């Protein structure tokens, strides 16, 4: 993914203020909550039968932290999102067999979570820069297919 000096600052400056803990599980929860069919991949997490149920679910909060990490890792190697996610690709593609479309969904929920968190700071331009990133991650994650 490209990213201009301006797009770089906008993203990084904002990403620095993120809460590695909360934000992490917030995106994952909403995903499972907004796109129910995703739960089929986390049955071993217990009661996901309700929002409060999944939103509070500790297994979520925990795994969401790992996902956030994965992104932070991508932002560091935008020049090589491919090698950066190579192992993750194999995992989700060959092992788990998750459809790429759902990666796209996670990126978008992430985007929503951030807009909610930062509010008026998440200006349109900041979003556009982030859609670029999310688009880049989703493509790299799904490389073990094409």
């Amino acid at each position: 993914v490209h990213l201009t000096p301006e797009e770089k600052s906008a993203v990084t400056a904002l990403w620095g203020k993120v809460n590695v803990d909360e934000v992490g599980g917030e995106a994952l929860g909403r995903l499972l909550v907004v796109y129910p069919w995703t739960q089929r991949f986390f049955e071993s997490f217990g009661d996901l039968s309700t929002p409060d149920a999944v939103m509070g679910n500790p297994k979520v909060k925990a795994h969401g932290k790992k996902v956030l990490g994965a992104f932070s890792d991508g932002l560091a190697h935008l020049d090589n999102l491919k090698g950066t996610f190579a192992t993750l690709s194999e995992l989700h593609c060959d092992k788990l067999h998750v459809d790429p479309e759902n990666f796209r969904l996670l990126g978008n929920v992430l985007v929503c979570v951030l807009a909610h968190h930062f509010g008026k700071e998440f200006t349109p331009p900041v979003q556009a820069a982030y859609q670029k990133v999310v688009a880049g991650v989703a493509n790299a994650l799904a490389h073990k297919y094409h």
Binding site: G29, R30, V33, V34, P51, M55, N108, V111, C112, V113, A115, H116, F118, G119, K120, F122, P124, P125, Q127, A128, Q131
Partner: protein, 141 residues
């Protein structure tokens, strides 16, 4: 489709938007044109510059369409009727773009209604926008 719980969740959230419906609508459009440039091929006769009066004026029309969809949440088809031929037949809008606007609309709402944009209300709006889009594309199949 939209359950009783969704229906109430939608009404509530839109109630909050209130008189800002028009400005949030202009904001969603702008977010879309920026994050999703292919959608601009549909507004060539538009000056998509930031403080564009055209964008602001169209965001109002979009917001009012949505306001009406909510007001007739139980009969969106007949209600949105006109908007369907305009988009589907007349402008022949690529269905995938409805997904992009719906996303920017949720982003806009989440950036203004921190208290209301809870997970449940979020899923609700998604379902709602999902439905509104379905109708606006109903003329395709």
């Amino acid at each position: 489709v939209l359950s009783p719980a969704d229906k109430t969740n939608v009404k509530a959230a839109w109630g909050k938007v209130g008189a800002h419906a028009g400005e949030y609508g202009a904001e969603a459009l702008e977010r879309m044109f920026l994050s999703f440039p292919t959608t601009k091929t549909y507004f060539p006769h538009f000056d998509l510059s930031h403080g564009s009066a055209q964008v602001k004026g169209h965001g109002k029309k979009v917001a009012d369409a949505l306001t009406n969809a909510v007001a007739h949440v139980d009969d969106m088809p007949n209600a949105l009727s006109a908007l369907s031929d305009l988009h589907a037949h007349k402008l022949r809008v690529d269905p995938w773009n409805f997904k992009l606007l719906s996303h920017c609309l949720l982003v806009t709402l989440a950036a203004h209604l921190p208290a209301e944009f809870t997970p449940a209300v979020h899923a609700s709006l998604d379902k709602f926008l999902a439905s509104v889009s379905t109708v606006l594309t109903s003329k395709y199949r």
